[PDB]
Amino acid sequence: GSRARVYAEVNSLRSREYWDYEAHVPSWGNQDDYQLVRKLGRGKYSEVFEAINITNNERVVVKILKPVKKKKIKREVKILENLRGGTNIIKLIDTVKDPVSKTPALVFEYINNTDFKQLYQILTDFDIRFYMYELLKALDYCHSKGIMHRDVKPHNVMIDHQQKKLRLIDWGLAEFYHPAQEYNVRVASRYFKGPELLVDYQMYDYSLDMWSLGCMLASMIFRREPFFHGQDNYDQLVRIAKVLGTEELYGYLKKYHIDLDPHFNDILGQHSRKRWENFIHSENRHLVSPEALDLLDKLLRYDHQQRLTAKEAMEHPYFYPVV
């Protein structure tokens, strides 16, 4: 088995109503209070609009939830309510339904995001440190609140680059951490899935988010986006092993008594561990530093229990200029 090194017991120390989301009962308002002005984006679970609340003329975001089970809606809503006011966590403002279709929708505060494909190519070293530190504040907060995000990726991190403002959004895959609990491995986007998910290890914890955050750090400093570009869920593990090494993979499997599906033995091959300096070239040298590589090496580890916690990462020398 395995347990989180930090915040393991926090949910058991809280009232049951805090984490018993199935018992939560949203109050569904009328979406006709909201004028849908502009399509801001979309995801696997919703279409997202810039909206105006017609009663107070406040600009907001309305995420219309594609059909889905009520237990999943209760989970996302309760998590958002528990995290309301947390540093750099998107604020849930309202839960509404269209009066005719009855389709549910979540109303959030509005952030003027710059699309990451365009933003990431103009970031400086200092900018990357700044935004990674802001994202870490959000993750340490939710982890301290007993919640794993489970879908950390650039599309779920909103950044207003002119106001230096960041919000971690899209808590639809988030889940409460309880020690010993076995979780669904079908979470996160392929490129950001931790090795624990790709080898079907279900007793994971907040450290899954730190893998995803290291994936983002690597893409930002090295400019290879996504950094681990698997062609499918099996090749995803291969892409990781070609960097971290195969002997190190087997050591992790052995430690947690994980049986790797036999099909993997051929496609994995044998790969030495690579020095992170190997990914530096003329197009990214001005974003890479020894301190960035040290932090990266301590996040992208097979063993989830040895990865830095969010708070440990925040104390790393890479962030001294932004503390």
Binding site listing for ATP: 40-48, 63
The partner in contact with residue 203, picked from ligand GNP, Mg ion, a second copy, none with C-beta cut-offs of 5 to 8 angstroms by kind, is: none
For 161, phi then psi, to 5°, come to -75, -25
Nearer to a second copy, 110 or 204 (CB): 204
The partner in contact with residue 294, picked from a second copy, Mg ion, ligand GNP, none with C-beta cut-offs of 5 to 8 angstroms by kind, is: a second copy
Nearest distance, CB of residue 2 and ligand GNP, angstroms: 26
The partner in contact with residue 320, picked from ligand GNP, Mg ion, a second copy, none with C-beta cut-offs of 5 to 8 angstroms by kind, is: a second copy
Q: Does 62 bind ligand GNP (CB under 6 A)?
A: no
Contacts of 184 (CB under 8 A, 6+ apart): 202
Q: Does 212 bind ligand GNP (CB under 6 A)?
A: no
Number of residues that bind a second copy (CB under 8 A): 26
Q: Does 41 bind Mg ion (CB under 5 A)?
A: no
Listed ranges 79-87, 112-120, 161-169, 286-294: which one lies at the site for a second copy (CB under 8 A):
286-294
Q: Which of 127, 140, 151, 170 is catalytic?
A: 151
- Three-state SS across the chain? CCCCCCCCCCCCCCCHHHHCHHHCCCCCEEHHHEEEEEEEEEECCEEEEEEEECCCCEEEEEEEECCCCHHHHHHHHHHHHHHCCCCCECCEEEEEECCCCCCEEEEEECCCCCCHHHHCCCCCHHHHHHHHHHHHHHHHHHHHCCEECCCCCHHHEEEECCCCEEEECCCCCCEECCCCCCCCCCCCCHHHCCHHHHCCCCCCCCHHHHHHHHHHHHHHHHCCCCCCCCCCHHHHHHHHHHHHCHHHHHHHHHHCCCCCCCCHHHHHCCCCCCCHHHHCCCCCHHHCCHHHHHHHHHHCCCCCCCCCCHHHHHCCHHHHHHC
Q: Does 48 bind ligand GNP (CB under 6 A)?
A: yes
Nearest distance, CB of residue 321 and a second copy, angstroms: 8
Q: Does 277 bind a second copy (CB under 8 A)?
A: yes
Nearer to ligand GNP, 5 or 273 (CB): 273
Taking each helix axis from N to C end, the angle separating 290-299 and 207-222, rounded to the nearest 10 degrees, works out to 150
Radius of gyration of the chain (CA): 20
Q: Which residues, numbered 103-132, are part of the site for ligand GNP (CB under 6 A)?
A: 110-113
Q: Does 154 bind ligand GNP (CB under 6 A)?
A: no
Q: Does 175 bind Mg ion (CB under 5 A)?
A: no
Look up 303 and say whether it is catalytic. no
Q: Does 56 bind a second copy (CB under 8 A)?
A: no
Nearer to ligand GNP, 76 or 140 (CB): 76
Number of residues that bind ligand GNP (CB under 6 A): 21
Nearer to ligand GNP, 48 or 287 (CB): 48
Chain positions contacting ligand GNP, by CB under 6 A:
40-46, 48, 61, 63, 110-113, 151, 155-156, 158, 169-170, 172
Active site residues: 151
